Design a protein around this nucleic acid. Structure first.
Ligand SMILES: [Zn+2]
Lengths: 56, 206, 69, 145, 141, 63, 53, 56, 63, 143, 101
RNA sequence: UAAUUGCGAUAACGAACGAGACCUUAACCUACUAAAUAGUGGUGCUAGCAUUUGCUGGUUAUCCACUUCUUAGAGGGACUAUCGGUUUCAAGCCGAUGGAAGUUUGAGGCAAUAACAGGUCUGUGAUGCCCUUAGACGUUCUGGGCCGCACGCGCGCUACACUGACGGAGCCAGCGAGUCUAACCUUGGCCGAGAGGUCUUGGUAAUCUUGUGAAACUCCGUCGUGCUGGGGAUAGAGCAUUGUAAUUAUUGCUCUUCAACGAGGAAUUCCUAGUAAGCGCAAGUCAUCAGCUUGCGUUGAUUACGUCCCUGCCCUUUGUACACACC
């Protein structure tokens, strides 16, 4: 808590990047296309667009 | 002149010169006129000014410089020898002192004195290197009034500068003596020496 | 070399020769005479004192004077 | 206007403490000709000596001259702070000196021979004539002299 | 209520702001008069707008000014433009088109930016060189 | 060079070839006509078209 | 459990170094990174930044 | 490599792309490297519309 | 000295391999029929005067 | 009719007030005034060791007339300037702090000035009046 | 009734803008005060790097960017539309915050 | 044309990439929406002079109004608009008008096909192959070095001084950054000559640091052309902090020592307007140090508006014993 907005948003970007590389490295078999982040108060949602859900 | 007094008190000497005629600091541009032909349109005095500061855009066009006041061009030429770039204000003060001095000795219109100095320093023939397989000789050619005048100003300021440098005399004093010995064809000035040298060289190369 | 003090003959010379000029200043003194330079400043003060010369302008770098009248 | 015509009371180029000082010059920078003194130290000592420094240096009769000598050689005694001194908390006397025109070099030589005797690396850079403090040697100092 | 006017002048990064009101005819800036703006030469550059029009036109209007930013000379240019703006702005509003146009013509026959700001601006540094146009040296060998 | 390129020449040509009984010689109303009539993604280029069309109708009025 | 390898050290190059490569040649500490640029600009929009001029 | 690239490109231009491109760089069947280049339809490389329309 | 002035009628071009030269036609300012070619150094337009020492030379193309 | 200091030029008002402060003579100058170089980045102490203090204080009070509140860190930034680092490039350096401190002190002693809440110091109504009077002096020096 | 402060921050100006607009819309759909959005000076985060890993080549530099915008709104209302308007307006790429008074 | 930009011409026709277009940035907007983290103005309350009502001030919200300055959303605004002259009288160019703006408006960004054995395994947990791998090339901890000095070269900093050094005072910018599970920016107060110390305070920021009162620059005055007081190297003494740390001096403060250098030979780089040049400021490295770099703004020019003569580039043509391509 109590963090500047600049450093917060840079951290958001780094969070996005780390998740993206992570799902790239993990979900190769499953046809991973991309991600989306939706920050809310209480239940922050992460959508994952990939080919197969049977496997994901 | 019939003054107009006002809340800000504003001295009368200043209202006086203002609403009487639109002079330089103390110096009129009436009765001054170019002595020499070829040398109107290039040396331009018929608008007046107050002091020779102006941020104008003269380098854009080929010749809008020539519509610039010659004094502004002179000030602009002093700010060089790079310890004095951006020191056009210092130059204006130096020029102020110089006109005071050229009035002190030469009561005449010192603007006109300057005009005569320029027109007497303007080399009316100048050299160029022909291509010339071998020695690539020099060829005598004429020189436009504008380049003539520019080199004139340059020569005057450079002579004054090289005098004033390792010497106690101030840039205004050197400039004053240079303009004086140039307004007359005294042949004591750096400028007139160079004029004679170049012109005589041209005579040799024709 | 120039001179950095008076011998009273320079004192006479100044009052005798400077009114010859319609143009007077520091280096004018330092050339026509041989003066320590700072003393040309003091002398131009001494002729600002009374109407031996008439300053039409001055400055800290430079000073401008003339004939008495 | 300080226009004064004084004739013979002036005395041009003169000498003090085995070192010559022009009389024809402003006194503060005049004394700078001495060694172990800077412009502002010369300012300070004359400031303590109650002198009019608009003068040139041929003025200031022997009384004022010797007074300045005293204020100089006895610095702390005339309210000189320790921190304006060339040699502070010396070495073995541990005191604060303004060693001067010849003793300056005497004492420099003393310190030099001291650490060259004890054979410190600083003394050995002094020994072989190298750039003492830790700048690089490769590219500078040439045209050795 | 006080049939006044507000304008502004500008330069590279100096900006002048002025308020021109029906008044006794004072002329001041930053709590100080025009008479004491002391770079000590360009006092005349700020005089100029008073004088292309003449001085009777100001006895009827008090004039307050301030500036901010730029440099010592940029501020002078900002003010000497803002002034001629404020006056002719007053005359747009409170006197006739013909007088206003006479004012403008008096200025413009003489113009030194005077009411049209100098649109020259600084350029950015392009890398590998200390300036936009300037560059460092090379050796070639 | 203050040249106009082929896209502009072509579009202006087609505009005048099928809207000749509009398209006055005034840049501004022709500009509004362009904004009303065409599927265009840049104001700058739109001005280019308007100016050129005007020049075109002008020399057409000259025959 | 011995003192005196970091005998002298605490400022100067070497307590500021790259996650990627421990590089300290002219790092960038803006916004908490300390990435040597050799790494970083390959990480360039791997931050999520973009350039427009 | 040919079959793979042309099948992908075929699938894309079937999916409805305006154009595609496949560059394969390195050592393919030998030591000296060679960049093979496969493509279809259309592409631009310089405006901001690159940043708008194409995904790389 | 028999100095002459000459008012420019027409520029002919910029000779000289490097282009510091400018050729020109000029009327001798005393004789309307005296139109003469000559070389010049600096910036020039028409409606301007040059000063001549030699009123005879009439140089030609150069390099 | 009605006078302020901003209607006076800076240097001449300052100098008039500086000289006035000595004709008064009651200013409480310290003893180390004669030695300190006025900054670690000046090249020399004041050429006029006599009244540089009074010039400084007269400048200070003028500063405080026009500013709401001002403080020591600001004064040192102000009266300090470019340094002479010799061989490596110059840069701006703040002036000495003890100087401005003692100036503030002996000025609030006179009550021209006072501590300002919100920080620093500010003129008193007393000094306000006095300095309007001195501005009137500087104006009426024109006979 | 409460006297609330709100702030919006984002890079996606179109998202933040229409979010602000819908906020103001729902607000003045049942008039609250007005407190229009206060477009603050936008913030750019500037990088300066060399385009080139190991520095063979021309000294090619590159400045990356993160163009950030911010703006705030005040309002006044009781319990319900406070919590309704806090949550009902939400968007990815757009960060939000509320303060009591 | 700046352009394979067009005019057109035409065994070519019709298409595509590139350039352009595009996006960014900076310049115009009294037109809109707003604003105690931007501003005003009045209103209260209040200081000072004058008092004749006024001028300068203060007062975080006394309240009110406004948005011109400020900021930022959408929009407008230039298209070479108008006139004139040019030209196959086409594409286009020149001049003038007006315009915030008339060089592609400026400066950028982006950037084709083909190729280099250009650089990089010392960016990568990208990586083939080889080598090693326990007395290891891994890892850790002891110091040192990378800085070692006859010399050569490169980028650069400071000077050679009067267009200057120095002492006072004036005081004017902007790009930016900034403390959480911590110790940034630090104001302000006190002490200290200074460097620094010390007690508090604002700030996760248009709120506080900060108007970052920067520099030069300006005005007054000391200086007097004397390697001079220019110059401040080198070298010495001590004080500060920085820091488990300072010797191989960290840096800075105090004092002393005052080198060389009088515009720099042959040779050679950069640049055409807010440009060069000077000027300093921030950021970058920063738990210290920039003489480095990226950006910023302040002051602010001379000269040209052309040529291919050098150095090379572009297109055509031509010649050729070259194709590792005139090295
Ligand atoms: Zn790294």
């Amino acid at each position: 808590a109590l963090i500047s907005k600049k450093r917060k948003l840079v951290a958001d970007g780094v969070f996005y990047a780390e998740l993206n590389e992570f799902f790239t490295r993990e979900l190769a078999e499953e046809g991973y296309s991309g991600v989306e982040v939706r920050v809310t108060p209480t239940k922050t949602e992460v959508i994952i667009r990939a080919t197969r859900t049977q496997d994901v | 002149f019939t003054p107009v007094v006002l809340a800000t008190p504003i001295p009368e000497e200043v209202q006086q010169a203002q609403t009487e005629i639109k002079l330089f600091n103390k110096w009129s541009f009436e009765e001054v006129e170019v002595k020499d032909a070829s040398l109107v349109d290039y040396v331009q005095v018929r608008q007046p000014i107050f002091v020779a500061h102006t941020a104008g855009r003269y380098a854009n066009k080929r010749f809008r410089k020539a519509q610039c006041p010659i004094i502004e061009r002179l000030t602009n030429s002093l700010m060089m020898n790079g310890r004095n770039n951006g020191k056009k204000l210092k130059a204006v003060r130096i020029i102020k002192h110089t006109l005071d001095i050229i009035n002190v000795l030469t009561d005449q219109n010192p603007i006109q004195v300057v005009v005569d100095a320029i027109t007497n320093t303007g080399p009316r023939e100048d050299t160029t290197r022909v291509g010339g397989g071998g020695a690539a000789r020099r060829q005598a050619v004429d020189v436009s009034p504008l380049r003539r005048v520019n080199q004139a100003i340059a020569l005057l300021t450079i002579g004054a500068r090289e005098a004033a440098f390792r010497n106690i005399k101030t840039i205004a004093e050197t400039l004053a003596e240079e303009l004086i010995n140039a307004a007359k064809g005294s042949s004591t000035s750096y400028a007139i020496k160079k004029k004679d040298e170049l012109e005589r060289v041209a005579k040799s190369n024709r | 070399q120039h001179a950095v003090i008076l011998d009273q003959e320079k004192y006479d010379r100044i009052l005798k020769e400077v009114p010859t000029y319609r143009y007077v200043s520091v280096s004018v003194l330092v050339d026509r005479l041989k003066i320590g330079g700072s003393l040309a400043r003091i002398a131009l003060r001494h002729l600002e004192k009374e109407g031996i010369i008439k300053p039409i302008s001055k400055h800290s770098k430079q000073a401008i004077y003339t004939r008495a009248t | 206007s300080l226009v004064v015509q004084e004739q013979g009371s002036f005395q041009h180029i003169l000498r003090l403490l085995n070192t010559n000082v022009d009389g024809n010059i402003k006194i503060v920078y005049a004394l700078t000709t001495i060694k172990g003194v800077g412009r502002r130290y010369s300012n300070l000592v004359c400031k303590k000596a109650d002198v009019d420094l608009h003068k040139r240096a041929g003025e200031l009769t022997q009384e004022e001259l010797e007074r300045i000598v005293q204020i100089m050689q006895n610095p702390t005694h005339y309210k000189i702070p320790a921190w304006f001194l060339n040699r502070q908390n010396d070495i073995t006397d541990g005191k604060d000196y303004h060693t001067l025109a010849n003793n300056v070099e005497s004492k420099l030589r003393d310190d030099l021979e001291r650490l060259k005797k004890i054979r410190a690396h600083r003394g050995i850079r002094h020994f072989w004539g190298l750039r003492v403090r830790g700048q690089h040697t490769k590219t500078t100092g040439r045209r050795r002299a | 209520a006080v049939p006044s006017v507000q304008t502004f002048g500008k330069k590279k990064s100096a900006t002048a702001v002025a308020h021109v009101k029906a008044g006794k005819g004072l002329i001041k800036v930053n709590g100080s008069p025009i008479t004491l703006v002391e770079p000590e030469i360009l006092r005349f550059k700020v005089y100029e707008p008073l004088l292309l029009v003449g001085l009777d036109k100001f006895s009827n209007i008090d004039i307050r000014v301030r500036v901010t930013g730029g440099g010592h000379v940029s501020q002078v240019y900002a003010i000497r433009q803002a002034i001629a703006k404020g006056l002719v702005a007053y005359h747009q509003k409170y006197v006739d088109e013909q007088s206003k146009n006479e004012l403008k013509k008096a200025f413009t026959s003489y113009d030194r930016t005077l009411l049209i700001a100098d649109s020259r601006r600084p350029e950015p540094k392009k890398f590998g060189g200390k300036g936009a146009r300037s560059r460092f040296q090379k050796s070639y060998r | 060079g203050r040249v106009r390129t082929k896209t502009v020449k072509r579009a202006s040509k087609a505009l005048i070839e099928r809207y000749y009984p509009k398209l006055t010689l005034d840049f501004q109303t022709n500009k509004r006509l362009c904004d009303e009539i065409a599927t265009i993604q840049s104001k700058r280029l739109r001005n280019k078209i308007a100016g050129y069309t005007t020049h075109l109708m002008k020399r057409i009025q000259k025959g | 459990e011995n003192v005196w390898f970091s005998h002298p050290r605490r400022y100067g190059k070497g307590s500021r170094q790259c996650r990627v490569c421990s590089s300290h040649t002219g790092l960038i500490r803006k916004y908490g990174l300390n990435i040597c640029r050799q790494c970083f600009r390959e990480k360039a929009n791997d931050i999520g930044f973009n350039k427009f001029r | 490599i040919r079959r793979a690239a042309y099948g992908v490109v075929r699938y894309v231009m079937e999916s409805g792309a305006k154009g595609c491109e496949v560059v394969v760089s390195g050592k393919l069947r030998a030591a000296r490297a060679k960049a093979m280049k496969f493509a279809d339809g259309f592409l631009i490389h310089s405006g901001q519309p690159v940043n708008d329309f194409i995904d790389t | 000295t028999p100095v002459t002035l000459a008012k420019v009628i027409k520029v002919l071009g910029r000779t000289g391999s490097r282009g510091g030269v400018t050729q020109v036609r000029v009327e001798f300012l005393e004789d309307t029929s005296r139109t003469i070619v000559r070389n010049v150094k600096g910036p020039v337009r028409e409606n301007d005067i040059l000063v001549l020492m030699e009123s005879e030379r009439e140089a030609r193309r150069l390099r | 009719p009605g006078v302020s200091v901003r209607d006076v030029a800076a240097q001449d008002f300052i100098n008039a007030y500086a000289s006035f402060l000595q004709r008064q003579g009651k200013l409480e100058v310290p003893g180390y005034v004669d030695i300190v170089k006025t900054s670690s980045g000046n090249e020399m102490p004041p050429q006029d060791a006599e009244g540089w203090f009074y010039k400084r204080a007269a400048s200070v009070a003028r500063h405080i007339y026009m500013r709401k509140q001002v403080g020591v860190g600001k004064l040192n930034k102000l009266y300090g300037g470019a340094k002479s680092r010799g061989v490596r490039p110059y840069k701006h350096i703040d002036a000495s702090g003890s100087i401005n401190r003692k100036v503030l002190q002996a000025l609030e002693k006179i009550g021209i000035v006072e501590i300002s809440p919100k920080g620093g110091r500010r003129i008193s109504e007393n000094g306000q009046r006095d300095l309007d009077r001195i501005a009137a002096q500087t104006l009426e020096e024109d006979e | 009734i409460i006297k609330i402060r709100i702030t919006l921050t984002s890079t996606k100006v179109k998202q933040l803008e229409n979010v602000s607009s819908n906020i103001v819309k729902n607000a003045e759909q049942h008039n609250l005060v007005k407190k229009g959005p206060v477009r603050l000076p936008t913030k750019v985060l500037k990088i300066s790097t060399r385009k080139t890993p190991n520095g063979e080549g021309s000294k090619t530099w590159e400045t990356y960017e993160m163009r950030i915008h911010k703006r705030y709104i005040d309002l006044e209302a009781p319990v319900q539309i406070v919590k309704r308007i806090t949550q009902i307006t939400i968007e990815p790429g757009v960060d939000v915050e509320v303060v009591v008074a």
